[PDB]
Design a protein around this nucleic acid. Sequence first.
RNA 1: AUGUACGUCGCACUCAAUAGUCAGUUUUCUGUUUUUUUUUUUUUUUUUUUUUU
Length: 110
Amino acid sequence: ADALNKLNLRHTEILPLYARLSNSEQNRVFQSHSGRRIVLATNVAETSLTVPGIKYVIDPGTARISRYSYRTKVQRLPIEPISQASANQRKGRCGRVSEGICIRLYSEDD
RNA sequence: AUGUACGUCGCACUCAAUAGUCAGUUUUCUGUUUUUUUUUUUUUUUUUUUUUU
């Protein structure tokens, strides 16, 4: 969000979204705007939120996955590439209003 | 009582100077004084995720 604000995009605003977000700030994403808004989201909009007004989705193919191993004896959360169904779930969250373009920031064979 | 005896001598200092043996290629570094202090104690820094009589 700092990097998108530094470019100073014309007629565009940047919005965050996560589980720790304020309820007023969570609902502010749901309220309308003028022009184009860019929403930076986490796995909250993956599962339960179903944020509306989304045309194009950008997928890094990278998320954090909570784990717990016998060696660790500790809930470790390493950064890992996502699954196929989760990536295919990232395809469907922009085809809500009309036809959208999904961009995945990795290789097809990956 | 008488007569009775006398003469010459030596010594010192010395003593110099002698055989043969020719030659060794060209070039080179190495070199000087000056500011001097070599060392000054450190810090807390980020967030998949989601459900319970």
